[PDB]
Amino acid sequence: QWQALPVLSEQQSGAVELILAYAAPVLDKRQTSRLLREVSAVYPLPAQPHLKRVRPSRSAGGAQSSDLLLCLAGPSAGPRSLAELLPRPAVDPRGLGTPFLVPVPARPPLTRSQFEEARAHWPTSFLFSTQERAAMQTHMERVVCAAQRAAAQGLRAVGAVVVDPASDRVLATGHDCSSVASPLLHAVMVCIDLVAQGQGEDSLPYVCTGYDLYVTREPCVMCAMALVHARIQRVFYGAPSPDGALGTLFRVHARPDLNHRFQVFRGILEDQCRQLDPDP
Amino acid sequence: PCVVSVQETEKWMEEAMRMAKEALENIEVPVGCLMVYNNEVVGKGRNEVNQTKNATRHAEMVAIDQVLDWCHQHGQSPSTVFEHTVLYVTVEPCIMCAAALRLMKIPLVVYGCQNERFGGCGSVLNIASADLPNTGRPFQCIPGYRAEEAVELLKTFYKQEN
Ligand SMILES: [Br-]
Ligand SMILES: [Br-]
Ligand SMILES: [Zn+2]
Ligand SMILES: [Zn+2]
């Protein structure tokens, strides 16, 4: 039992902003399909495709009713009638009630606590599926197994794997290897070295473009920044690290001033990973 | 044995400059650097990213590997060498390299021009003196040495890339 949390920038972690739109009740349930077609051909809402156009509502007895998302509100959002909002003959407003203003999410939700606030106002589009969840689990039991091997040997208990999501082919597994002679062989630095030596003669030095990295615990500053330099596309990790740079102390995967950004999900097999070693 | 390295800053940095020029010529980000322990150069590195096809192979990390090789081959504890080593580099260490020098417990970096795209000693983040109780020790910086010369080479390189 576990769940994947997105680490987004502070800017994107806040509440989704709202904008005002006009909605109207569907008093004739059997006009719904027809009215949805005619309305969203006039008001296709091209910049808010995450909004569902039909909002259901279960009565206190299960009796269902619905309002329809007519259009966005203008600069002066006063009361507005059906005759003023929907042109004719292009729309036949039979079956609709008097329009009303409703706040709606301006942008699609990203975090699951943002889906919560946003579905409160108006239903939206959207975490991981069964098939994917099991697959991400397999890659993370692999890093855990690797972290345990390092702990038994005498090294830091940090496991990393690099995976190609196009074929789900593991490209490099490695654990921490820091020694007195070689103190910077953190789990992430070892995987980047392993992918690097395995790539072909015609390769750009962005050794990790497109690839996913799963690591037991969140990378240190050195590892994280290297991931940005290497152009990893997604990073999954289990437990945070106190000095971690993908969510704890820094969020280098989501800065504007670096020429690369990437998604980070924390909390995958976190129950197991939490008892392992933090980076560094 | 630390400030003893600082006396030839002129010479040490002139030599870092000649390597930045080399990197420039070989389509690498023009950044060169030396690592001086007890007035002897124990490690040099220019940026080797495009040659090795390994994004992490920055000048500073090529030099660190070279010092660690020197420590291995001569049987010297890297802790006692790095802690009295000064790094001379023509460009302010990136965020990654700054964390590297911290974890190596290097005490002092002398550097040239600001790293506006990736700098880790204040320009983008301040990894160099941040409060990171588990990421090594913070180091100190003498910025600015021959910065006008060094920044020109960056500006040249990026006018040259796609
Ligand atoms: Br999930
Ligand atoms: Br940040
Ligand atoms: Zn690390
Ligand atoms: Zn660097």
Residue numbers in the entry:
A (entry chain B): 25 to 150, 164 to 317
B (entry chain A): 14 to 175
Could you give the paper's own sentences about this structure?
ADAT2/ADAT3 is a heterodimeric enzyme complex that edits adenosine (A) to inosine (I) at the wobble position 34 of tRNAs starting with an A in their anticodon (ANN-tRNAs). It recognizes specifically tRNAs through the ADAT3 N-terminal domain (ADAT3N), which subsequently rotates to present the bound tRNAs to the ADAT catalytic domain, composed of the C-terminal domain of ADAT3 (ADAT3C) and ADAT2, that carries the catalytic activity. Given the ability of inosine to pair with uracil (U), cytosine (C) or adenosine (A),22 the A to I conversion at position 34 provides an extended base pairing capacity to the modified tRNAs and is essential for decoding the C-ending codons, as GNN-tRNAs do not exist in eukaryotic genomes. Mutations in ADAT3, the catalytically inactive subunit of the ADAT2/ADAT3 complex, have been identified in patients presenting with severe neurodevelopmental disorders.
The ADAT3 V128 residue (corresponding to the V144 residue in humans) is part of a large hydrophobic core located in the middle of the N-terminal domain of ADAT3 (ADAT3N),21 while the ADAT3 A180 residue (corresponding to the A196 residue in humans), is buried within the ADAT3 C-terminal domain (ADAT3C). Crystallization assay of the ADAT2/ADAT3-A180V and ADAT2/ADAT3-A180L complexes were successful for the former complex, while the latter failed to crystallize. Following structure determination at 2.9 Å resolution, comparison with the structure of the WT ADAT2/ADAT3 complex revealed that, unlike the p.V128L variant that mostly affects the ADAT3N, the p.A180V substitution causes small local perturbations in the structure of the ADAT3 C-terminal domain. Here, the crystal structure of the ADAT2/A180V-ADAT3 mutant complex did not reveal any defect in the ADAT3N domain, but rather local perturbations in the α-helix, where the A180 residue is located, and in the ADAT3 C-terminal domain β-sheet, both located close to the interaction surface with ADAT3N. On the other hand, A180 is located in the long α-helix that immediately follows the ADAT3N domain. Co-expressed with ADAT2, the V128M ADAT3 construct was almost as soluble as the WT construct, whereas the A180V and A180L constructs were less soluble, albeit the A180V being slightly more soluble than the A180L construct. While the p.V128M ADAT3 exhibited a significantly impaired enzymatic activity (−68% of A34 to I34 with the lowest concentration of the ADAT2/ADAT3-V128M complex) as expected, the ADAT2/ADAT3-A180V heterodimer retained comparable activity to the WT complex and the ADAT2/ADAT3-A180L displayed a severely diminished deamination capacity (−76% compared with the WT complex at the lowest concentration). Interestingly, the p.A180V variant that does not affect the deamination activity of the ADAT complex as demonstrated in vitro restored the migration defects as efficiently as the ADAT3 WT construct.
